[PDB]
TrEMBL record, chain B:
Protein name per UniProt: Probable fatty oxidation protein FadB
Pfam families (UniProt xref): 3HCDH (PF00725), 3HCDH_N (PF02737), ECH_1 (PF00378)
Domain 3-hydroxyacyl-CoA dehydrogenase NAD binding: 336-513
Reactions catalysed, as given in the entry: a (3S)-3-hydroxyacyl-CoA + NAD(+) = a 3-oxoacyl-CoA + NADH + H(+)
Biological or metabolic pathway of the protein: Lipid metabolism; fatty acid beta-oxidation; Lipid metabolism; butanoate metabolism
Highest taxon of the lineage: Bacteria
Taxonomic source organism: Mycobacterium tuberculosis (strain ATCC 25618 / H37Rv)
Sorted UniProt keywords: Fatty acid metabolism, Lipid degradation, Lipid metabolism, Lyase, Multifunctional enzyme, NAD, Nucleotide-binding, Oxidoreductase
GO biological process: fatty acid beta-oxidation
Amino-acid positions noted as binding ADP in the UniProt annotation, renumbered to this chain: L640, Q641
Binding site for CoA 3: A74, G76, K79, R183
Residues given in the record as CoA 1 binding sites: T35, A74, G76, D77, V78, K79, R183, Q316
Length: 402, 728, 402
């Protein structure tokens, strides 16, 4: 019934893992800063109309525990009636928060909702929350748990992606991120992080290496950090993918997503809510879909979710102007492009997480806001946003410029 | 449950003695056997003793747990555990809960409890000792300590998992103690903390136990009788699962376990790891009850019954002479003469020497028979440096063997074992020049793998004493001997080879003369099914994965490279001629075409240097890339479980044929012969036990096996049709 | 747009905190047991039509980390396309999961959803996840953080509820829970927990004290375990509520909700999804609402949330047959009853969390399933379900029997 519109979409710059500028900043402060930016852009908005704040967060412990969405409501001085709920759907948590917000608006029982995500991976590392799929032996053994990087190496092995193929995509991601920054494509949506005194902490994506060359990417060593360096996971993967004899380990730190800190916020509402508060809609949520694929390969969820959201919207690949898929690993994007025959010039046109980083809970909201801006900048019509997820899940969203 | 009792009660097992100092000695002495065993009698006996320890608590100062047998305590009641049905899960759970309540009460009595370990403490025996506060072991020869429940498909359910994890942490307890059931000598047991102190003789045990109690009461009054995990401030070695250091590596424990088992369907190691980690997350009593539930699921499952059937009942029916002829006395063996230098002839000489027999190694020349004795020589050149030198015994072993190159040195031989090239004319000859120089009662044994024993017998005058004695390389490590009756082989000759097999510490099976015997014939169907799938276009990697995940020690294409494909071609040609000679016709197996395609490509196995795998510097290094183009790999993609079942069912059906044709006379020989002879997966309990223990979508039992075999027959061929003997 | 129907609603019994029967049960197993029970009741249901599994969980840590909803999908052998997302909105997480499921169905973008919650408080105690409001002294100092118990005592002080008043409600809750169990009201919705061998672990709510007396409740001491026992929280509360001189500490362990372990599951779908699977609808979700109130008193959120859902559904208090409010504290229920003039015979008619326990993330779905059964048993029509929440939030839902 009610249509869901995007009125604002902003994000912080992404701070890097080691000696990063955002390490001293509580993840709660990253969200409050974006709330203050929304207030700056609409100082007469009646925040009592905002009925919920929905934040994705993959490691909701420590600084990110205790429903950080409600903490952001209280700490920012928003009305006590504004709710606040944390959710976790691994890498797609940020987009799931936006989709849940859009569905609350469509249901007619909510009018104006804040949605996004926050992840301070330098302060709350991945896995800090534990979990059963990894730590409980009986179920770990049964589901054949394998780290993401090994599934991505398996994809490259099965599809025939060489080390040079994944490094070529990584170079292209670095170049398009540098061109987008230098061209001013991100000037309106990246909100610099500042301290309690107004001093600048960070105003750009620290993880980027614009001078990346193909020769530098070739010198990098295959991934060996954390769980993957531990033994057995190659054999577990090949016990299920039994027709593959040996896994070609092509992924490194240079063609995999960066570990970064960041947050993102999206304001979603009905037409009546926007008319009432004098808000101009930037885009419309056309359709959403959740699906999945094999959790041992773990990164092939994007393809069924993308087909499902195209079918639900009555669209085909040719009707989409921009495709935005999170760059968790280079082979995941190359597989996605190969399966759906995505033209090269439509895919991740402003660079991706390989160059700028993948702040787990916030990434989905970040790349959605990226597409809202690039549609408006190109005067293009439709964009499709999707992410691969741990556990073999997939989430996809289609937006239409307004 | 809240009692130390579970249910003409059984007879008492424990004797009670309270000395003048208040120290109670519990001596375990089951009058119904030579070994204390965790049976109904023990449970009722320990229940009474523990009830009394609590009732008389005000006059008791300490407890010593001892044994009057040669061993301390070893094993459970397998007769009972093998009968436990899934509907008996509650009774199994209540039993181990009762056992652990007794041990827990003993452990929390408020006074020190010492275990006086005089001999072997295995399984439930070590679990009793772990419930004590101090362990003293006598460093006597033959004593072992460990928890080998996993080797029967069970787990240490009387507290062994919970207590060793509390003592050593998750990683050390699982890797070194629980997952493989490792047995430790008393010296090594003290080093790793399983035992606290050692004494030289068993007579020092109880005095040393009462002395330690006296000193513990004087020097540690507040901590006397308090286990480390019952004190405030207990820290688990290596941390708990919620500890950040252990949480980082914990997700890799199941994957490394899958890597070691190669995906085989053995449920016990998975359950041990689950009980260990889950138990480390909660208090001791809760951890103990979790352990009981995983124990009950193993006992009431089928795999544990397979392994109990094979490694307990079947192996002891064989060692008790089930296949040995009845009413035949023993006959001494004075000299043994081997007719051949080589990997077989040399290994036979060593295993005969170590048993206490003099051996004469004959060959075509003494410079070649010296190379034969060089094999046992290098075997002793290894045993010496590993701290396992029998010194004069080893030199006497090598001195027992005596190369020669002439028949004159076989003078006093009354037991001949030939190991020469497979050629009747050669064999018929090499027995002729030796038949008259040996003793009049000598046994003429042949280690052939193809030629018929009845046909080889015609080359000697005493055909009643000609018999097949089939060894497996390496002879020093392979524990099976396949004894083959010729048509004219006498029962006396069979009984004497049977006794010789036991004397050299190996396991005999008795096979009647038939093409392929039992081991070579059954393992052929395993290899041929794999080669068939390769010729059908199945991915070579999937075939090897199916072999490993089925539980075989070597995947079948790797095994084909080591059996040599040319030798497989010869067995095919010989099987042809013989079938054709007797008027029959030979339906060729599809594997023969795969064998021929590899030979004409110059890829015939590991010795050739190129087979299904590539070989560099002798070691195996990946499948041959040209394999997929040669056989159109990928054109056929059956489910992995179909490939697994095709290999297991082919061997199980060929085993049932052998039993129906009288090639074998007992399923015990079939099971042990398949497990120990050709490497049939131990979780099945043997190629014959696999039929009554099959479990899958169709259910569990012989009827489920029949249904699955018919399902395989429709999809892949009538060689999977079940025989009449398996049908109702 | 599309209507959202409840097709199934089950729960585990609630095991107690000290020496409880469920202490040995992984919270993942609690959820899997309920999934298996749904399979027994509908063996022919095509599980590929289930597009998401939404679980509330307030302490998503350790045994409850790593998106337990996805773990439940994989461990139970559900299709890998079935998603799985964890969310946290404190005490309303279980009801919020049901509401999000309903709103997903109403948006037309999901068809059949499992929703519920899980909390093993004996294994993962409250606060194990940390919290951005108790570990950020700057935030704590500004929001004037106060434990829920002091807010409940403050409600008793402001409203004139005596120790005997709140103890009289606690007695009433024990009685009605005992009558409900004796009358067989719960026989078909409480699913006994069993081990891997089929052996019974728990089949009743072992926190109940059916022989509670008024004299026994009078002997209990005011609550003085946890954060409240520490200093300062009375003074912080009265710095805001400055017209109150002294707080009357009336709440004990006998008139507050119990600490328990439990899980609950609800199957929610559209009418088309039900028809296609041969499912019988049991109730219709009429409306939902999310509001809040002051976070220092922290427990008066249910009052505007109930008015908001009544106004949205175009209904009044007279139209509701059964009111179900979570009994976090006795005074919270007494204020709700006084503020809205709720008849006694309509309020928490089968007892509540004082008698049976409050397993945080699952409670919202438990009392929802309780009202579905009691509406069917009474042949009544409308029930309203609401819960107070830490941080001053409120959630409410109206259902109609079908
Ligand atoms: O820990 C061990 O190895 C063990 C072996 N047997 N038992 C006692 C037992 C006997 C029959 C049925 C259930 C349990 C414990
Ligand atoms: O294999 C060996 O010789 C060995 C010696 N120490 N460890 C570590 C260990 C510690 C505690 C309990 C078991 C093992 C293994
Ligand atoms: O990843 C590690 O750090 C590691 C250390 N030891 N292991 C071997 C092991 C296998 C199975 C169960 C427990 C331990 C793995
Ligand atoms: O049954 C076997 O073959 C087997 C082999 N290893 N284990 C246990 C183990 C696991 C990981 C690391 C060390 C030991 C059991
Ligand atoms: O005999 C039994 O009780 C049994 C139970 N499960 N399985 C198969 C299995 C083996 C290893 C790991 C997972 C499953 C056999
Ligand atoms: O095709 C057959 O009939 C067949 C029988 N055994 N094999 C394999 C084998 C090779 C060398 C020695 C022993 C066995 C193949
Ligand atoms: O209630 C307690 O447990 C407690 C402990 N220390 N204090 C005093 C304190 C005040 C301000 C900052 C730090 C400490 C109170």
């Amino acid at each position: 019934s009610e249509e869901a519109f995007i009125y604002e979409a902003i994000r912080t710059p992404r701070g890097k893992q080691k000696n990063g500028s955002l390490h001293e900043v509580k993840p709660l402060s990253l969200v409050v800063g974006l709330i203050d930016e929304l207030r700056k852009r609409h100082p007469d908005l009646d925040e009592n109309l905002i009925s919920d704040v929905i934040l994705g967060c993959v490691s909701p412990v420590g600084d990110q525990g205790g429903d950080i969405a409600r903490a952001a409501v209280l700490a920012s001085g928003m009305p006590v009636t504004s709710g606040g709920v944390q959710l976790n759907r691994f890498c797609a948590s940020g987009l799931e928060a936006v989709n849940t917000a859009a569905q609350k608006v469509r249901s007619g029982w909510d009018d104006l909702v804040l949605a996004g995500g926050v992840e301070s991976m330098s302060r709350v590392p991945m896995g800090s929350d534990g979990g059963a799929m990894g730590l409980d032996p009986a179920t770990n053994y049964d589901v054949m748990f394998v780290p993401q990087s090994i599934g991505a190496d398996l994809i490259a092995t099965i599809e025939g992606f060489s080390r040079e193929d994944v490094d070529a995509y990584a170079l292209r991601s670095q170049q398009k991120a540098a061109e987008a920054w230098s061209g001013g494509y991100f000037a309106k949506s990246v909100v610099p992080v500042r301290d309690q005194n107004g001093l600048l902490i960070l105003d750009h994506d620290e993880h980027m290496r614009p001078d990346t060359t193909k020769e530098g990417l070739a010198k990098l060593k295959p991934a060996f950090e954390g769980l993957a360096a531990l033994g057995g996971f190659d054999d577990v993967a090949l016990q299920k993918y039994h027709w593959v004899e040996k896994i070609n380990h092509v992924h490194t730190g240079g063609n995999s997503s960066g570990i970064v800190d960041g947050a993102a916020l999206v304001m979603i509402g009905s037409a009546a809510a926007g008319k009432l508060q004098g808000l101009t809609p930037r885009a419309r949520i056309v359709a959403t879909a959740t699906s999945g694929a094999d959790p041992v390969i773990m990164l092939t969820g994007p393809t069924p979710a993308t087909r499902k959201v195209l079918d639900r919207a009555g669209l085909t690949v040719d009707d989409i102007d921009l495709f935005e898929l999170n760059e968790a690993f280079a082979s995941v994007v190359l597989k996605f492009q190969k399966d759906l025959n995505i033209p090269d010039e439509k895919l991740n046109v402003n660079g991706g997480a390989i160059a700028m980083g993948h702040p787990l809970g916030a990434t989905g909201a970040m790349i959605l806001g990226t597409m809202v801006d690039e549609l408006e900048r190109r005067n293009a019509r439709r964009a499709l946003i999707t992410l691969c997820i741990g556990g073999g899940m997939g989430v996809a969203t289609i937006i239409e410029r307004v | 449950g809240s009692s130390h009792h579970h249910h003409s009660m059984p007879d008492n097992t424990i004797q009670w003695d309270k000395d003048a100092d208040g120290i109670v000695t519990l001596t375990m002495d089951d009058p119904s056997g030579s070994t204390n065993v965790m049976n109904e009698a023990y449970i009722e006996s320990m229940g009474k003793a523990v009830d009394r320890l609590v009732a008389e608590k005000d006059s008791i100062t300490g407890v010593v747990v001892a044994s009057a047998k040669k061993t301390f305590f070893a094993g459970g009641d397998v007769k009972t555990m093998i009968q436990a049905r899934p509907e008996d899960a509650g009774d199994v759970f209540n039993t181990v809960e009762t056992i652990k309540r007794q041990l827990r009460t003993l452990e929390t009595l408020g006074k020190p409890v010492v275990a006086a370990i005089n001999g072997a403490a295995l399984g439930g025996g070590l679990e009793i000792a772990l419930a004590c506060h101090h362990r003293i072991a006598a460093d006597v020869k033959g004593s072992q300590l460990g928890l080998p429940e996993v080797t029967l498909g069970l787990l240490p359910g009387g507290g062994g998992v919970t207590r060793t994890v509390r003592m050593f942490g998750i990683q050390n307890a699982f890797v070194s103690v629980l997952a493989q059931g490792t047995r430790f000598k008393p010296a090594k047991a003290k080093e790793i903390g399983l035992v606290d102190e050692l004494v030289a003789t068993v007579e020092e045990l109880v005095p040393a136990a009462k002395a330690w109690i006296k000193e513990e009461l004087k020097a540690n009054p507040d901590g006397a009788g308090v286990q480390p995990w019952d004190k405030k401030g207990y820290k688990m070695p290596g941390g708990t699962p919620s500890s950040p250091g252990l949480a980082a590596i914990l997700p890799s424990f199941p994957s490394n376990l899958r890597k070691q088992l190669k995906g085989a369907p053995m449920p016990a190691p998975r359950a041990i790891l689950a009980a260990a980690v889950e138990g480390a997350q909660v208090d001791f009593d809760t951890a103990s009850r979790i352990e009981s539930r995983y124990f009950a699921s193993l006992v009431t499952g089928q795999v544990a019954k397979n392994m109990m059937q094979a490694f307990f009942f079947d192996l002891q029916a064989i060692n008790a002479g089930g296949s040995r002829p009845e009413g035949i006395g023993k006959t001494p063996i004075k000299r043994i003469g081997v007719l051949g230098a080589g990997m077989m002839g040399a290994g036979i000489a060593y295993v005969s020497a170590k048993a206490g027999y003099e051996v004469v190694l004959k060959d075509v020349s003494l410079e070649a028979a010296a190379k034969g004795k060089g094999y046992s020589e290098k075997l002793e050149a290894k045993a010496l440096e590993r701290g396992r030198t029998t010194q004069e015994r080893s030199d006497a072993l090598l001195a027992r063997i005596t190369p020669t190159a002439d028949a004159a040195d076989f003078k006093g031989v009354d037991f001949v074992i030939e190991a020469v090239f497979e050629n009747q004319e050669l064999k018929h000859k090499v027995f002729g020049e030796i038949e008259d120089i040996v003793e009049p009662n000598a046994i003429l044994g042949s280690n052939t793998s193809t030629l018929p024993i009845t046909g080889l017998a015609t080359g000697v005058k005493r055909q009643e004493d000609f018999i097949g004695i089939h060894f497996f390389s390496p002879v020093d490590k392979m524990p099976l001997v396949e004894i083959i009756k010729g048509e004219k082989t006498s029962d006396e000759a069979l009984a004497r080879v049977f006794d010789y097999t036991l004397a050299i510490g190996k396991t005999p099976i008795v096979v009647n003369d038939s093409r392929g015997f039992f081991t070579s014939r059954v393992i052929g169907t395993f290899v041929n099914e794999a080669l068939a799938m390769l010729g059908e276009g199945v991915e070579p990697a999937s075939i090897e994965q199916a072999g490993s995940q089925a539980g075989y020690p070597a995947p079948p294409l790797q095994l084909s490279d080591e059996l040599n494909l040319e030798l497989m071609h010869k067995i095919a040609v010989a099987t042809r001629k013989g079938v054709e000679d007797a008027g029959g016709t030979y339906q060729p197996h599809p594997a023969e075409a795969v064998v021929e395609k590899m030979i004409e490509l110059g890829r015939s196995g590991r010795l050739k240097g190129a087979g299904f795998y590539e070989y560099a510097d002798g070691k195996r290094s990946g499948l041959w890339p040209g394999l997929r183009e040669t056989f159109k790999s990928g054109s056929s993609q059956p489910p992995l479980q179909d490939m697994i079942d095709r290999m297991l069912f082919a061997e199980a059906l060929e085993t049932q044929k052998c039993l129906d044709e009288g090639v074998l006379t007992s399923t015990a020989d079939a099971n042990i012969g398949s497990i120990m002879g050709i490497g049939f997966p131990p979780w099945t309990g043997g190629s014959a036990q696999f039929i009554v223990g099959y479990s899958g979508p169709a259910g569990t039992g012989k009827a489920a096996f029949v249904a699955r075999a018919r399902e395989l027959a429709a999809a892949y061929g009538d060689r999977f049709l079940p025989p009449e003997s398996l049908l109702s």
